[PDB]
Design a binder for these strands. Structure first.
Ligand code: DGT
Ligand code: MG
Ligand code: MG
Ligand code: MG
Ligand code: MG
Length: 342
DNA sequence: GGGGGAAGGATTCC
DNA sequence: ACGGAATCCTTCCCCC
C-alpha cells in the first residue's frame, strides 16, 4: 500500500548548540528569544531534556525558566545556524527517497514505499538513517514508521527521544480506539474542547456522530480529516511543500499607538523580510499587529503586480494607519507579511 | 444560486 | 507571553 518513514530531530536547537560547543552536553540548556522589553523578557524556543525535566520548555517565559533553573545555560536563538544544519540533514534523507516532504525545520516525511518491502526492512532503513545522520552531523533523531503520514508522526512522538518505532496495521487499529483524540496532529485545545462536548474522546468516537454535526462544530476540513483517520482510510500523499509567505514581526520596547514610534520597528521588519524574500516578488502585503492584550489584528492589500520595497514601505504605513484608526488598543508587536509571489 | 477572489481572523505547532 | 508560516472558515463583493 505505502510505508512512511518520518524523522524529527531531537531538542533540535538546543542540540545544535551542543554540537557547536560540546562542553554544554550534560548541562541543562535553554535557547531563548529575548523580546527586549527588559532583562530576560521573552520566551523559550526550546530546551534540552536535562532542563525539560523540571518544566523548562518551549513557550514559557525565560524569567520563569530562570526561577526554576537559575544556573542553566541560556543561549539566544540563532535560527540561521540551525537552518543550515537542517538543510544538510535534509540533503542526506534525500539519499533514501526522492519522495520527500520537509514539514518543518526539524521534521520531514519520506515515502519509502517502492524502496523497501515490509516493516522489518523499513525499520532497518530507519536505523541506517539514524546512524548515518549521527555520523555526519552528530545529531540524534527519532524515527516513526507507518502506513500514512499522521501515524508515522505519532509513532515518533511515542518513540522520542533518540528512538525509532513502527506502528503496524494491527496497532493502527488499536490506536484508533486507544489514542486520545488530542494526541492527534492538528488537534489543539480549541478543537479538543469542542470535541469533548460531542463526547468524542477517542478517534473511533467520531465514527458515531452525524457528519453534519461534526462539520457544524469543527468545520468540514477538520471533520473529513478525522473521520478519515478513524476509518483507517487517511492517505494524503507525501509532497514537497512550497513557501507561500515570508515575513517578520518584532516586539517594541514599549507598547505604543504613536506612528513615529512604531514606524522604525515596521521598517526594520520590512527590511529583514526583503533580504529573506531573496529573488522572490510578492503581490500581496499584510501588516500585522499584536495589541497590548496579545490579540492579533491585520490589514493588507493585493496589487495587480509585484511590490517594490518603495511600494511596501509606503503601503505598510497606510495599513498601519488603518489599524490604529480601526482599533483603539495599543500595539505591542508590529510586523509585515508578504505573499502571492510571482 | 453559485463561481472566484480578496480580506480579516481563527487555530495549529507541522 | 516569541514568533514563522500553512490551512481553513466566515463575510463581503462583483457578476452572469
Ligand atoms: N522560537 C521558537 N521555536 C520553537 C517553538 N516551538 C518549537 N520551536 C523550535 C525548537 C525545536 O528545536 C524546533 C523543533 O521543535 P519540536 O516541537 O519538534 O521539538 P524539539 O525537536 O525542539 O524537541 P523534541 O526532542 O522533538 O521534543 O522547533 C516556539 O514556540 N518558538
Ligand atoms: Mg524535534
Ligand atoms: Mg518537529
Ligand atoms: Mg494536541
Ligand atoms: Mg513542538
Amino acid at each position: 500500500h505505502m510505508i512512511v518513514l518520518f524523522v524529527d530531530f531531537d531538542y533540535f536547537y538546543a542540540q545544535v548548540e551542543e554540537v557547536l560547543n560540546p562542553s554544554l552536553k550534560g548541562k541543562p540548556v535553554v535557547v531563548c528569544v529575548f523580546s527586549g522589553r527588559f532583562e530576560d523578557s521573552g520566551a523559550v524556543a526550546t530546551a534540552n531534556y536535562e532542563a525539560r525535566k523540571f518544566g523548562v520548555k518551549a513557550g514559557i517565559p525565560i524569567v520563569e525558566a530562570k526561577k526554576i533553573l537559575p544556573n542553566a545555560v541560556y543561549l539566544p536563538m540563532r535560527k540561521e545556524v540551525y537552518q543550515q544544519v537542517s538543510s544538510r540533514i535534509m540533503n542526506l534523507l534525500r539519499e533514501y527517497s526522492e519522495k520527500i516532504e520537509i514539514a518543518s525545520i526539524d521534521e520531514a516525511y519520506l515515502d519509502i514505499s517502492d524502496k523497501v518491502r515490509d516493516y522489518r526492512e523499513a525499520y532497518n532503513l530507519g536505523l541506517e538513517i539514524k546512524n548515518k545522520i549521527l555520523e555526519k552531523e552528530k545529531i540524534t533523531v527519532t524515527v516513526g514508521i507507518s502506513k500514512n503520514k499522521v501515524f508515522a508522526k505519532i509513532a515518533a512522538d511515542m518513540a522520542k527521544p533518540n528512538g525509532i518505532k513502527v506502528i503496524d496495521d494491527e496497532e493502527v487499529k488499536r490506536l484508533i480506539r486507544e489514542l486520545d483524540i488530542a494526541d492527534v496532529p492538528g488537534i489543539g485545545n480549541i478543537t479538543a474542547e469542542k470535541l469533548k462536548k460531542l463526547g468524542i474522546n477517542k478517534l473511533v468516537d467520531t465514527l458515531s456522530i452525524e457528519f453534519d454535526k461534526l462539520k457544524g462544530m469543527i468545520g468540514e476540513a477538520k471533520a473529513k480529516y478525522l473521520i478519515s483517520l478513524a476509518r483507517d482510510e487517511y492517505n494524503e500523499p507525501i509532497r514537497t511543500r512550497v513557501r507561500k509567505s515570508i515575513g517578520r514581526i518584532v516586539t517594541m520596547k514599549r507598547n505604543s499607538r504613536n506612528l513615529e514610534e512604531i514606524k522604525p520597528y515596521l521598517f526594520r521588519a520590512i527590511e529583514e523580510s526583503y533580504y529573506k524574500l531573496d529573488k522572490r516578488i510578492p503581490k500581496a502585503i499584510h501588516v500585522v499587529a499584536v495589541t497590548e492584550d496579545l490579540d492579533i489584528v491585520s490589514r493588507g492589500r493585493t496589487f495587480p503586480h509585484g511590490i517594490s520595497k518603495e511600494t511596501a514601505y509606503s503601503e505598510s504605513v497606510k495599513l498601519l494607519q488603518k489599524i490604529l484608526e480601526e482599533d483603539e488598543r495599543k500595539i505591542r508587536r508590529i510586523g509585515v507579511r508578504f505573499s502571492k509571489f510571482i
